[PDB]
Amino acid sequence: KNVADGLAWSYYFGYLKFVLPELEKQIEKTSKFRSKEKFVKKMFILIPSNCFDYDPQNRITFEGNTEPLEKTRGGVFLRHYKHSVYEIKDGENEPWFCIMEYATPLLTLYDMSVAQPGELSREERDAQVVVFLRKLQDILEGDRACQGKYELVTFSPDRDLADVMLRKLKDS
Amino acid sequence: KNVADGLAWSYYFGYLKFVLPELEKQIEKTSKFRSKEKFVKKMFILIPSNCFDYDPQNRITFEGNTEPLEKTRGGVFLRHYKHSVYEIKDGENEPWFCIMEYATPLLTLYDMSVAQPGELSREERDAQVVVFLRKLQDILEGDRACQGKYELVTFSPDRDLADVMLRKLKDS
Ligand SMILES: [Ca+2]
Ligand SMILES: [Ca+2]
Ligand SMILES: [Ca+2]
Ligand SMILES: [Ca+2]
C-alpha cells in the first residue's frame, strides 16, 4: 500500500537531501573533472524495467569517483558519500562524462520480488514502483536545493544503455 | 502499516545481503587492523531512542575505514561499500576496535517525522520503528550468511554511547 512513500521518503532524507545540493561543489573538488568540459554536473538516477549486460558495444567506462562527502552524525559517526562518474563514447566524437546511479531503493523491490514472491508479488511491486518514481519526483520537485540537480532515466534491453544516455546528454 | 517491512527488506537486499557475509574478509584486508586484536569482527547497528553529542568524555574516535567492497552491477555500475571502524577507550586499559553503523533506514524515520509529521506521526512512526527492528531480525535470523555477523545496540542520553558499547564488547 502506502509503503512506496516510505521508500521514497528514505531515499531523500537519507541520501538525496544532502548529496544533491552539494553535487556541483563535490564535482568541482575532483581535479580530474574540473577542467573536463562536456561534463553534465547532474545526477542521473537510472531505472531498469522488467527483469534480468547493459554494455554490449562497451561504450561506457568507469573513470573514477568524486571526492567523498564526509558527514558526521551525533558527533561520533562518520559516513562517506561519493559518486561514480562514467565516460560514454559518442563514436569518434568527444566523449561525455556523467554521474549515473543504479537506484538501490528500487532495486530492492526487484531483488525482493524475485526472492520473496509471497511477500512482494512481481505485479504487486509493479504498482509500488510506479508510485515510488512519481512520489520521488514530487518530493524533490518541492525541494529548491535538489531541483534540477537530478534526472530520471529509464532503460531496457531494447533500450541500449549507452544509446539512451547519449540521448539524455544532448538535452540536459 | 506494513511499510516497515519494506524498509527492512530494502536494508537487507540493498546492503546487509552482501556486506555482512564479507565483513570478516574485508576487515582482514585492512592492513591497519589485521594484527590488531581486541577488534570484534562484527557490525554493530546502532539505534537511538527518543529525539535529539554522544561523546562527552570523548572516548570514541574514528580510526579509518575498512577496505571498500567493489560491487559492479549490470556490467556498468560500480559501487563501493566501506565501513567505519572506531576506537573506544576502556579507561587506562587496552582500547577496543569495533564497527559501528548509524542505521540509515531507521534514521530516515526520525528525520522525516520531525520535518513531515502529517505524513509520519511521532506515534505512527514509533510503531514503524519497533516493527522494523523486529522485522530486520527475522530476515537476518533466517540468513545463515548474515547470522551472528551483526548485533543491535540501543542508546540514549542517559545511556552514554561509549559506555553502552564497552559492555556489548565485553559480553560478545
Ligand atoms: Ca580544461
Ligand atoms: Ca564498460
Ligand atoms: Ca599483532
Ligand atoms: Ca570522538
Burial of A47 (0-12, 13-18, 19+ CB in 10 A): middle
CB A151 within 8 Å of CB A172? yes
Looking up cell 571526492, which residue turns up? A67
Tell whether A120 lies on the interface with B, counting CB pairs under 8 A.
Answer: yes
**C-alpha closest to that of A50 among A139, A157, A148:** A157
- Specify the pairing of strand A77-79 against strand A71-73: antiparallel
Reported as type and span, the H/E element at residue B71 is strand B71-73
Q: CA end-to-end span of chain B, whole Å?
A: 34
Bridge partners for A2 per DSSP: none
CB A160 within 8 Å of CB A56? yes
What are the residue boundaries of the structural domains of chain A, listed by start?
Answer: 1-39, 40-172
- Specify the pairing of strand B77-79 against strand B71-73: antiparallel
Q: Dihedral of CA A161/A162/A165/A166: which sign?
A: negative
**C-alpha closest to that of A27 among A68, A61, A60, A71:** A68
**C-alpha closest to that of A116 among B162, B142, B72:** B142
Identify which of A15, A55, A78 has the shortest CB distance to residue B76.
A55
Q: Cβ separation of A10 and B9 shorter than 8 Å?
A: no
**C-alpha closest to that of A80 among B29, B80, B11:** B80
Residue A58 C-beta-side C-alpha neighbours within 13 Å: 0
Chain A residue whose CA is closest to B75:
A53
Q: Which residues contact A56 (CB under 8 A, 6 or more apart)?
A: A160
**C-alpha closest to that of B144 among B28, B15, B20:** B20
Interface of A with B in 63-82 (CB under 8 A): 65, 73-80, 82
Tell whether A116 lies on the interface with B, counting CB pairs under 8 A.
Answer: yes
Tell me how far apart the alpha carbons of residues B68 and A156 are, in angstroms, rounded to a whole number.
Answer: 29
Neighbours of A2 (CB within 10 A): 12
**Domain range B1-39, CATH class:** mainly alpha
**How many Å lie between the centroid of ligand 2 and the Cα of residue A157?**
16
Q: In this structure, what are the phi and psi dihedrals at residue B120, rounded to the nearest 5 degrees?
A: -140, 100
Output the nine-digit C-alpha cell for B39.
577488534
User: CATH fold of A40-172, please?
Assistant: Rossmann fold (3.40.50)
Any alpha helices (H) in chain A, and if so which ranges?
4-11, 17-19, 23-27, 31-34, 104-115, 124-140, 161-169
Tell me how far apart the alpha carbons of residues A6 and B120 are, in angstroms, rounded to a whole number.
Answer: 9
Bridge partners for A152 per DSSP: A45
Tell me if A1-39 shares its fold with A40-172: no
Tell whether A157 lies on the interface with B, counting CB pairs under 8 A.
Answer: no
